[PDB]
Point group: none
Chain length 55, copies 2
């Protein structure tokens, strides 16, 4: 069952929608920064899950 | 090094934050339909988090 892995990864990517363009300069910038680090989390996790299937 | 794990746990927290419990308003039938969708999303996040953490061997 690879399918569990792929649906999980799919779900992860679905869960980080673009950040809010609106608010103060710093609310705008802080949300971009948090979006980019969540995306790094999502990538690293996804890498790790697929690595269990080795390669 | 624990970086990969703390990374996982912060994302998991975000996942749970994105599924807040509902306010019990509207028709009783809407209230129950809405708690039901919430439990299914919450269960989804729960199982996702577990597989993520089990990936770290613990």
């Amino acid at each position: 069952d690879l399918l569990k892995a792929v649906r999980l990864i799919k779900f992860l990517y679905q869960s980080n929608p673009p950040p809010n363009p609106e608010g103060t300069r710093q609310a705008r910038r802080n949300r971009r920064r948090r979006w980019r680090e969540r995306q790094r989390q999502i990538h690293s996790i996804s890498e790790r899950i697929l690595s269990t299937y080795l390669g």
